[PDB]
């Protein structure tokens, strides 16, 4: 169970990184809306990771 949680935690970190790439891509694109979605996801994910 702990390993699954660790995997989930690892997945969350990976998910955050993927979201970060999108945010970086959005900046290059110059579209504000794409960037906003990524930021919200990072904050909730970080909180979940801390709890885990």
């Amino acid at each position: 169970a702990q390993k699954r949680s660790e995997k989930q935690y690892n997945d969350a970190q990976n998910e955050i990184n993927k979201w970060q790439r999108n945010a970086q891509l959005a900046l290059q694109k110059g579209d504000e809306n794409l960037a906003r979605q990524a930021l919200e996801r990072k904050k909730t994910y970080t909180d979940t990771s801390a709890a885990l």
Binding site: A23, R36, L39
Partner: peptide, 12 residues
């Protein structure tokens, strides 16, 4: 605040 942060990133 997030929008402001994005703008700062955009400037660089």
């Amino acid at each position: 605040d997030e929008l402001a942060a994005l703008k700062a990133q955009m400037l660089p």
